[PDB]
């Protein structure tokens, strides 16, 4: 749980530079690591309005096996 926020913070405000990390975290079998991927999407796209990240977040929100 701590590392989930930590990994996201490591890539704060990095725009697409976090993509290689994000697709790694979002595809992980660990639900906490998928939560870390969501947080990394948030941190790497802080206020950029990037509709690609919004699309990914909405897709995970509507289709994910873990409520967290």
């Amino acid at each position: 749980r701590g590392l989930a926020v930590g990994i996201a913070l490591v890539m704060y405000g990095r725009m697409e530079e976090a993509d290689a990390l994000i697709e790694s975290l979002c595809r992980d079998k660990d639900p906490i690591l998928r939560r870390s991927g969501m947080y990394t999407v948030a941190m790497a796209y802080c206020g950029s309005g990037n509709n690609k990240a919004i699309r990914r977040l909405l897709h995970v929100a509507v289709s994910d096996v873990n409520d967290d």
Partner: protein, 32 residues
């Protein structure tokens, strides 16, 4: 103000596309 209006309309169109994709996904999972 023409360019600002045009760019805002472009962003609105892309946002609407995102919203429709999300709505279709949500319907797909809501059936399950």
């Amino acid at each position: 103000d023409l360019y600002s209006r045009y760019k805002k309309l472009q962003q609105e169109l892309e946002f609407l596309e995102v919203q429709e994709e999300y709505i279709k996904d949500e319907q797909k999972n809501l059936k399950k």
